[PDB]
Amino acid sequence: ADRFPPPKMVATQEEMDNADIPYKYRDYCAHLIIDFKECRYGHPLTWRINCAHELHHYNKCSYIEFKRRVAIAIEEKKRRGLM
Amino acid sequence: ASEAVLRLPHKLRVMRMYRTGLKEIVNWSYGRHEFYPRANALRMEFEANKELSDREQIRKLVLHGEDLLARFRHWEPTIRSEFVGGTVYGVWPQHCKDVKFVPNPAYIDEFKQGDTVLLY
Amino acid sequence: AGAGGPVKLSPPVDKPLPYNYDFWMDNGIYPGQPIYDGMFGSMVGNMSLEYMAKGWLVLLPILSAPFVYEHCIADDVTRNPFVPRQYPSEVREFLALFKNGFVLNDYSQPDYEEMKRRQSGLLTPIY
Amino acid sequence: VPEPPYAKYLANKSHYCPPDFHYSREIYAPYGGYFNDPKGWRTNTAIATLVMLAGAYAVFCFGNAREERLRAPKGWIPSQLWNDNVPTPVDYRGKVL
Amino acid sequence: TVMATSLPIVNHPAFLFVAGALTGFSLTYAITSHYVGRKEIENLVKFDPRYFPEYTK
Amino acid sequence: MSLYLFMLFLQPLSLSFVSRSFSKISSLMMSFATLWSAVYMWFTSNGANQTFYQVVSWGSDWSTFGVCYTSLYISLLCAFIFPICVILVQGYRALSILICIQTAVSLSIVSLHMLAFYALFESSLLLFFILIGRRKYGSLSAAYNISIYTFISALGFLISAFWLNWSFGSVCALLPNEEANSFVAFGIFILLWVKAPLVPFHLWLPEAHVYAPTAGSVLLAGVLLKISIVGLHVFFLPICASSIVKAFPLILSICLGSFIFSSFSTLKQIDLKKIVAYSSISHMAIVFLSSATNSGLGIQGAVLYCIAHGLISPGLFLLVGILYKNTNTKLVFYLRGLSQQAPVWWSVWVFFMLGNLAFPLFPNFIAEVVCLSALFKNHELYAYAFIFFSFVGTVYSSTVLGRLKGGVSSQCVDASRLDVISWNPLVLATVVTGIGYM
Amino acid sequence: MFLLAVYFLFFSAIANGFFGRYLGVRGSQLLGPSALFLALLCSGTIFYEVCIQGCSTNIKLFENFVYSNELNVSASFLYDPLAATMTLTVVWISCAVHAYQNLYMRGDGSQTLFTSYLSAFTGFMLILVAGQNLVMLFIGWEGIGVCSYLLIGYYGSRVSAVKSANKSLIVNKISDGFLLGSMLYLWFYTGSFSYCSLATFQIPDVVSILVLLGAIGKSSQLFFHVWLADAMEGPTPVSALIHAATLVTAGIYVLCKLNLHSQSAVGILGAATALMGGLFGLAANDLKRVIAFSTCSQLGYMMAVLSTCDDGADFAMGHLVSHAGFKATLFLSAGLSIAKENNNFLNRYGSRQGSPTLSFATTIASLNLLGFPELGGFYSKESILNNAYINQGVSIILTLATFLTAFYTSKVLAQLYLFPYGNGRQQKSFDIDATTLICFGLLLSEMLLRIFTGSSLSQNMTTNLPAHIKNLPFWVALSGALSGLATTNLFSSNFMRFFGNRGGFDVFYARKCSNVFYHNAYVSYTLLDRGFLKLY
Amino acid sequence: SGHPNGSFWSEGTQVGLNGFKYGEIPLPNGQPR
Ligand SMILES: CCCCCCCCCCCCCCCCCC(=O)OC[C@H](COP(=O)([O-])OCC(O)COP(=O)([O-])OC[C@@H](COC(=O)CCCCCCCCCCCCCCCCC)OC(=O)CCCCCCCCCCCCCCCCC)OC(=O)CCCCCCCCCCCCCCCCC
Ligand SMILES: CCCCCCCCCCCCCCCCCC(=O)O[C@@H](COC(=O)CCCCCCCCCCCCCCC)COP(=O)(O)OCC[N+](C)(C)C
Ligand SMILES: CCCCCCCCCCCCCCCCCC(=O)O[C@@H](COC(=O)CCCCCCCCCCCCCCC)COP(=O)(O)OCC[N+](C)(C)C
Ligand SMILES: CCCCCCCCCCCCCCCCCCCC(=O)O[C@H](COC(=O)CCCCCCCCCCCCCC)COP(=O)(O)OCCN
Ligand SMILES: CCCCCCCCCCCCCCCCCCCC(=O)O[C@H](COC(=O)CCCCCCCCCCCCCC)COP(=O)(O)OCCN
Ligand SMILES: CCCCCCCCCCCCCCCCCCCC(=O)O[C@H](COC(=O)CCCCCCCCCCCCCC)COP(=O)(O)OCCN
């Protein structure tokens, strides 16, 4: 946990509230989810084709966060001695 | 085997066993294509022991076939819709005539309609 | 033809009635039925309650085997190869409040013990 | 059996009635008879549609008076054309429209 | 003969074998996948030099 | 108040002077005048007078009459439901008996003196013995049951009233008195135990209802059972609260047991009237328990549920009477095809049965919600017990409806113009209360 | 504007069921579909305003519906994103079912009353979905329960239909009783019935259990699924409405609206119901029964996903909305097949010349159920299966259910179309009017739109899974479909029989629970009130 | 089958009373009850 420090949080409380982002989605990727959300709602039926850049960017950030979570897990497991 | 089946004579018992087995073949099949080989197999099964004359062996065969036909009874019998046990049996049953209708019911002794207390 | 199909009428009662005849439902059409099917009389598929119980006895262990492992044998540290989703402190503290939440299983957190005790909460209201 | 005198007042079997199906014609039900198709149905349906539109107008008036939107919509909503209590739309970023 | 008129391939021995093999593999893999997948997910990070220099050599 | 009491005294008086051929018309007009006077009493009742809206005394403690929340609702219910009973009954003898019973019951509700309450409610004792034991359609057994149960309970209540009059010196409700005695509490309680049927003292009710005329059954279920709640709110809780709190585990046991055993007994019934009677016994338990909690939520809930029952049970008893007139049978087994044969009777029957099951658009739903909330205020288990066992009512009602709904029938047995006229007020009142104008 | 939809449905109910003598059969064939079309226009406006543009609205009809002392509730409607989505789906399916009933119910005496019950049923569903307080939800819950009782038992001269309706009523009574208890707990300790103030971070287990027990009734889960299979006695339009949207979905909706569920219970109960329903559907030989068991399985998937992650509520609602369309299509097509063939058994169906529209609609609905890639059902089901991987137990059971689902669905498709003709050589025919074609056009339009618009915001968000684990649902579905086409035997006759008897839940209830119930009634009455306490 | 004249918007085929309301028989000359 300490070795892999959290990333800086680009999104502020005011922006997350203004974009109506639930608390669960405020996970260091909220700025990208705001971009994706605004684009998906802007294009109600054509988002799948049009809004693909934002989804890609969110998925990439999510991937990096997932890798961090796995790293934290491995570090904790090594500290406890299980592996 | 039920009591009604048991009371039946030997010939009628074997005819009933064949009939029931054919119906159960139909119920357990997935299409008409399956029925024909299975029905031919059932026919051959009965034909094979038809000439047996030993009463004891015949009784054993009958009893076993009855136990098999009891165990392999289908949860869902394939029954035509218009017959008893069918989806459309009783949906809108045909009304019989001679229905007793009382015309102008409220106008028969209108003022004195009600319950009376009779005393001694 | 949906309407007007022939039906068989149930015969009129002609013998002394049993005391518990209310268990039989007869509308006047020939095939009357018990109040609850399978309470008495013919059983569907010729399967008794004992047969059903023996089946459930054979089936239950195979169905329960996946669930028993993760829930009982496995532990928070070993259940998954990653930790629960990481949130900013303000978000995480609020999310930890929810008893039915998913952030209470973060062993890495220094508040793990409190969160675990929160998850296994009260059975009934104390007041 | 010789049909009773009142049978003249009662209606005939409708076109939709299956010929075999026999029903007692004397029984009255509010939902209608076995196969209905009354004469004058077209007028009754027109009256029904008019009562439906009038009640829709009343319901629309009531709803508009009671529809409280306390948070600004993200974008333009159709309610603006008919209802004046819609807060000015604000987008995801926060800019007012 | 299952579907002689419309889809005769079903009766073919090769079809039956391929369908059974797909059934076997998919069903057994569903149970075994949890261990296998969890391993590929642990390994993805453990052998990445940036995340964990010690394991890499 | 004075107008209502005067109209009440005029209704029995009018019969003595009528032509003996105009009796039914005069009785109906008098019943409507009594209803209008009750509406006037409601108009002249200001909510500003929180304790008692109006109190009138005519020279003695016995002649002290007054209206409160419970009294007002019950009196309005009695005046609303009496016209239906009047039209359903034919004959001068029957009218005389019914009008005397109604006058006694309606005077009991507004009475504020325990001894006067007893004098007025129990005056209608022989009249019920004679009514339930009528020559051809009555049963002597039912008459004896109801009469003996009433006499024993009311005598116990009378003994308690005599002790309170000796000890305090007055038995009027308006004078604040408190008693911790358990014998006196039991004496007052036993009347409530019997009148509002509670197991094991409920046997008198079903017999009386089955062998009573439709007007009698309608009056009994509609308001006679409610007279218990007036006695509880006016003559028991003010003086014997300590004993209700002391005995609450026992009260709860007896009320829940009544609800359960009555529900189970309803399952073995083959007569429509007995089904409706046992449903009433089951429904009375919630009202009794809710009032015994001595909370605002409970007293209001109990009165509201009482009104809902006093609007739903007369409807079912009226429909059952209409069906019996058409068919001369009350056995569910003989009655089949009622959906096809009586679409108009069936619609109203289904509506009233839905009301009896406490569905949301019916007064029973709101009333039940309030009563359950009061029980939940006491304990969560108390509410849960009652909520769970409510399914038994569903099983019996569903079985009855299913047996009646379909089959083969050769008789057209539908309501006439008179029968629809008799239920229309009850239907409208049910709908209005259901939408929240309780 | 928001009220209009409920007004249109209740008006169509009152008109058809109280003034049907004047309107006529044709009048109901006009007023019903017209009102439903107007309600669809209103529901579409509501969906656009609330879901797409994030504008929730509250309409308070009147205050003090119940005003006893502290307890105070008002009749108010809050259109939140969940409400808008469900309103739209419900009205779309109801409009289609109303169009369908014009031709299907022509051979039924009370077409006016049927249409009235269908419109009242839709109105009570919209009341349940749009209620702002728990009392309004209860009003809707009971209204759908009563309408189901009046619709399943529509054929009164059939003892099976009346018993099926009694069964539904009793099961729903037990469930709404548990719900009433939970609502009382929530009112007492939170002070209100409104969902805004209802929010509680930590809830005692009792309330969670009561909520779950209440929900498992309408959404037929294990131990409470007996009524769904029996509900096949009713006419086909009823089955489409109840199974696709009105009844099964309510339980999920309640669980998602108030997140008081416990992860451990919902996951196990759901996965069990999914597997059992699929196994029961394997044995079934009635077309309408197989689609009911399929409904049970899908409900199991939706209940199970709530346990997996935070987005489980969104995933469940997304599956619910995707499922309603294809499932409705499956029931309407099954009904038309039954009507055309005068047969309910899969054995007697076969290839026969028909309408292209119906055969395509059946194929596409079956494909959505199966999980064919790039379809609305596929995305909504993969979202569940992929996210359930973390819970090892739930995932394994759900994959096995996916296999069984594919097997029966493929077997049904083969039996209805690919298989040779199995019915007799007799003259049978059902001609389809343009109204039926419009109904199938509407269902296909919903299915197509679902692919373009999606079901959840997080539908296409990446689940960080190895490729082999992400694409396994497809391989399992394909393997099951191939095994189903070959019509192979999977289980021994002992298990096939067990699954045909649906696990013997009803045999247990009849032999033990019903006997105990009537023995308690015998002791209560015969032995006591009319025995010990009755005079000679 | 189909519609009576082949057109949905055609006059109803039933002339008379669908049933007798309350069981009352219409007076022949139209006399009020
Ligand atoms: C000033 C200007 C003028 C304005 C006017 C103002 C004047 C004020 C009052 C004047 C009115 C006249 C009074 C009527 C006297 C006769 C009434 C009568 O005989 O009843 C039946 C009689 C009907 O006669 P009938 O049909 O021709 O046949 C009778 C035959 O003679 C025999 O027939 P049968 O053999 O077949 O018997 C069958 C019997 C079935 O058998 C039974 O049921 C017997 C039951 C025993 C009695 C019932 C017990 C319960 C009664 C409760 C009291 C009812 C009021 C309830 C209010 C609660 C009060 C605490 O059924 C009945 O008889 C009727 C059933 C119900 C009536 C019972 C009520 C009468 C109580 C006592 C009557 C008074 C007699 C006094 C005698 C005077 C000299 C002899 O009169 C009625 O119309 C009904 C009763 C009217 C009751 C009002 C009388 C007051 C009694 C209330 C007590 C309160 C104290 C008194 C103060 C009153 C105001 C100051
Ligand atoms: C044989 C019968 C044939 C004829 C059939 C008659 C058809 C009846 C039509 C059904 C009526 C539906 C209307 C339900 C609302 C009840 C109307 C009402 O109560 O008036 C309210 C005003 O409120 C309204 O007008 C509501 C608007 C009605 C129409 C709006 C939408 C229509 C869709 C129906 C959905 C309603 C759901 C409500 C569920 C509780 C009174 O206002 P307040 O002064 O606040 O009264 C105090 C409140 N309390 C009653 C509790 C004492
Ligand atoms: C909530 C706001 C608005 C409320 C509107 C509610 C919708 C309409 C309510 C109309 C009145 C409510 C109850 C009507 C009386 C109950 C009887 C009934 O509904 O049906 C009757 C007869 O129906 C009628 O004549 C009147 C029905 C007109 C409209 C009914 C719409 C559905 C009822 C709504 C359920 C009430 C909700 C109560 C609990 C929430 C009996 O029908 P069956 O038993 O099925 O037998 C008919 C014959 N057959 C075998 C062929 C089926
Ligand atoms: C995945 C989640 C689980 C879903 C369902 C799981 C159910 C598992 C429970 C069954 C497994 C254990 C059964 C108990 C062992 C009994 C072994 C043989 C049974 C036996 O000999 O007697 C039977 C007792 O009924 C019985 O066995 C009734 C006992 C059942 C306990 C109550 C549990 C609810 C059961 C609901 C569905 C089960 C259906 C089949 C049980 C039949 O008795 P008899 O009628 O022949 O006696 C004659 C009448 N004098
Ligand atoms: C210090 C004292 C020590 C204790 C000593 C106690 C000694 C006895 C006490 C018993 C007092 C109770 C009085 C009621 C007796 C029972 C009824 C009599 C039975 C009977 O046959 O009555 C028949 C009809 O009664 C019926 O139909 C009525 C059915 C039963 C009535 C139920 C009783 C009311 C509730 C009981 C208690 C309630 C609360 C207690 C506080 C009419 O017979 P007939 O006219 O044909 O005459 C012909 C001669 N056979
Ligand atoms: C066995 C279960 C009990 C059945 C009752 C269930 C529910 C009834 C509750 C009614 C609510 C108010 C009534 C007050 C008390 C009545 C019964 C309470 C239980 C009880 O018997 O307590 C007794 C005291 O009550 C007494 O001393 C009086 C008892 C009643 C007297 C019986 C007949 C009286 C009739 C008098 C007529 C009017 C007289 C007016 C002057 C002894 O309890 P304890 O305190 O000694 O504890 C010593 C134990 N270790």
PDB file of C-alpha atoms in Angstrom, chain F residues 329-413:
ATOM      1  CA  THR F 329     -78.966 -22.084   0.193  1.00  0.00           C
ATOM      2  CA  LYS F 330     -75.890 -20.953   2.084  1.00  0.00           C
ATOM      3  CA  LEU F 331     -73.781 -24.049   1.372  1.00  0.00           C
ATOM      4  CA  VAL F 332     -70.780 -23.123  -0.776  1.00  0.00           C
ATOM      5  CA  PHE F 333     -70.937 -26.584  -2.367  1.00  0.00           C
ATOM      6  CA  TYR F 334     -74.385 -25.984  -3.884  1.00  0.00           C
ATOM      7  CA  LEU F 335     -73.489 -22.495  -5.140  1.00  0.00           C
ATOM      8  CA  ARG F 336     -71.433 -22.660  -8.337  1.00  0.00           C
ATOM      9  CA  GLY F 337     -71.104 -20.689 -11.535  1.00  0.00           C
ATOM     10  CA  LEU F 338     -71.973 -17.455  -9.733  1.00  0.00           C
ATOM     11  CA  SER F 339     -69.497 -15.544 -11.898  1.00  0.00           C
ATOM     12  CA  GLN F 340     -71.323 -16.430 -15.121  1.00  0.00           C
ATOM     13  CA  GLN F 341     -74.830 -16.486 -13.639  1.00  0.00           C
ATOM     14  CA  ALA F 342     -74.604 -13.323 -11.483  1.00  0.00           C
ATOM     15  CA  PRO F 343     -71.995 -10.966 -12.970  1.00  0.00           C
ATOM     16  CA  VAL F 344     -73.359  -8.019 -10.986  1.00  0.00           C
ATOM     17  CA  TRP F 345     -73.687  -9.838  -7.683  1.00  0.00           C
ATOM     18  CA  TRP F 346     -70.265 -11.392  -8.287  1.00  0.00           C
ATOM     19  CA  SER F 347     -68.565  -8.048  -8.931  1.00  0.00           C
ATOM     20  CA  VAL F 348     -69.797  -6.605  -5.618  1.00  0.00           C
ATOM     21  CA  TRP F 349     -69.009  -9.850  -3.781  1.00  0.00           C
ATOM     22  CA  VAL F 350     -65.439  -9.848  -5.094  1.00  0.00           C
ATOM     23  CA  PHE F 351     -65.056  -6.163  -4.216  1.00  0.00           C
ATOM     24  CA  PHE F 352     -66.254  -6.705  -0.642  1.00  0.00           C
ATOM     25  CA  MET F 353     -64.096  -9.816  -0.223  1.00  0.00           C
ATOM     26  CA  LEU F 354     -61.093  -7.809  -1.412  1.00  0.00           C
ATOM     27  CA  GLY F 355     -62.040  -5.229   1.199  1.00  0.00           C
ATOM     28  CA  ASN F 356     -62.155  -7.918   3.884  1.00  0.00           C
ATOM     29  CA  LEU F 357     -58.588  -8.935   2.962  1.00  0.00           C
ATOM     30  CA  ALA F 358     -57.330  -5.373   3.656  1.00  0.00           C
ATOM     31  CA  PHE F 359     -56.267  -4.364   0.169  1.00  0.00           C
ATOM     32  CA  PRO F 360     -54.858  -0.836  -0.362  1.00  0.00           C
ATOM     33  CA  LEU F 361     -57.840   0.885  -1.972  1.00  0.00           C
ATOM     34  CA  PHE F 362     -60.105  -0.218   0.914  1.00  0.00           C
ATOM     35  CA  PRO F 363     -60.478   1.328   4.400  1.00  0.00           C
ATOM     36  CA  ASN F 364     -59.196  -1.908   5.929  1.00  0.00           C
ATOM     37  CA  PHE F 365     -55.716  -1.281   4.526  1.00  0.00           C
ATOM     38  CA  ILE F 366     -55.262   2.125   6.158  1.00  0.00           C
ATOM     39  CA  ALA F 367     -56.787   0.896   9.402  1.00  0.00           C
ATOM     40  CA  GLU F 368     -54.592  -2.211   9.487  1.00  0.00           C
ATOM     41  CA  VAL F 369     -51.483  -0.156   8.744  1.00  0.00           C
ATOM     42  CA  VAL F 370     -52.230   2.132  11.699  1.00  0.00           C
ATOM     43  CA  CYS F 371     -52.994  -0.789  14.036  1.00  0.00           C
ATOM     44  CA  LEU F 372     -49.853  -2.655  12.988  1.00  0.00           C
ATOM     45  CA  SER F 373     -47.843   0.529  13.511  1.00  0.00           C
ATOM     46  CA  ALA F 374     -49.233   0.756  17.053  1.00  0.00           C
ATOM     47  CA  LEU F 375     -48.264  -2.858  17.712  1.00  0.00           C
ATOM     48  CA  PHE F 376     -44.808  -2.229  16.259  1.00  0.00           C
ATOM     49  CA  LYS F 377     -44.549   0.737  18.614  1.00  0.00           C
ATOM     50  CA  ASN F 378     -45.093  -1.678  21.471  1.00  0.00           C
ATOM     51  CA  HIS F 379     -42.867  -4.498  20.178  1.00  0.00           C
ATOM     52  CA  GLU F 380     -41.670  -5.631  16.767  1.00  0.00           C
ATOM     53  CA  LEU F 381     -42.585  -9.250  17.511  1.00  0.00           C
ATOM     54  CA  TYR F 382     -46.143  -8.223  18.373  1.00  0.00           C
ATOM     55  CA  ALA F 383     -46.593  -6.736  14.909  1.00  0.00           C
ATOM     56  CA  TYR F 384     -44.814  -9.609  13.166  1.00  0.00           C
ATOM     57  CA  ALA F 385     -47.052 -12.251  14.757  1.00  0.00           C
ATOM     58  CA  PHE F 386     -50.215 -10.559  13.485  1.00  0.00           C
ATOM     59  CA  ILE F 387     -48.797  -9.781  10.039  1.00  0.00           C
ATOM     60  CA  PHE F 388     -47.620 -13.340   9.392  1.00  0.00           C
ATOM     61  CA  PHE F 389     -50.851 -15.147  10.335  1.00  0.00           C
ATOM     62  CA  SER F 390     -52.935 -12.900   8.064  1.00  0.00           C
ATOM     63  CA  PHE F 391     -52.301 -15.430   5.258  1.00  0.00           C
ATOM     64  CA  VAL F 392     -54.863 -17.806   6.782  1.00  0.00           C
ATOM     65  CA  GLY F 393     -57.612 -15.330   5.954  1.00  0.00           C
ATOM     66  CA  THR F 394     -56.392 -15.377   2.364  1.00  0.00           C
ATOM     67  CA  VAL F 395     -56.512 -19.182   2.157  1.00  0.00           C
ATOM     68  CA  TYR F 396     -60.140 -19.461   3.262  1.00  0.00           C
ATOM     69  CA  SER F 397     -61.316 -16.469   1.226  1.00  0.00           C
ATOM     70  CA  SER F 398     -59.514 -17.728  -1.886  1.00  0.00           C
ATOM     71  CA  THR F 399     -60.967 -21.220  -1.474  1.00  0.00           C
ATOM     72  CA  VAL F 400     -64.489 -19.825  -1.086  1.00  0.00           C
ATOM     73  CA  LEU F 401     -64.163 -17.511  -4.089  1.00  0.00           C
ATOM     74  CA  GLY F 402     -62.743 -20.326  -6.213  1.00  0.00           C
ATOM     75  CA  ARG F 403     -65.564 -22.700  -5.306  1.00  0.00           C
ATOM     76  CA  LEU F 404     -68.197 -20.029  -6.028  1.00  0.00           C
ATOM     77  CA  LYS F 405     -66.503 -18.578  -9.129  1.00  0.00           C
ATOM     78  CA  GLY F 406     -66.782 -21.492 -11.560  1.00  0.00           C
ATOM     79  CA  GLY F 407     -68.655 -24.664 -12.390  1.00  0.00           C
ATOM     80  CA  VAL F 408     -71.907 -25.695 -14.052  1.00  0.00           C
ATOM     81  CA  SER F 409     -75.145 -23.989 -13.027  1.00  0.00           C
ATOM     82  CA  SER F 410     -78.615 -23.955 -14.578  1.00  0.00           C
ATOM     83  CA  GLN F 411     -80.117 -21.096 -12.530  1.00  0.00           C
ATOM     84  CA  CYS F 412     -79.826 -17.365 -13.207  1.00  0.00           C
ATOM     85  CA  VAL F 413     -79.540 -15.943  -9.699  1.00  0.00           C
TER      86      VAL F 413
END
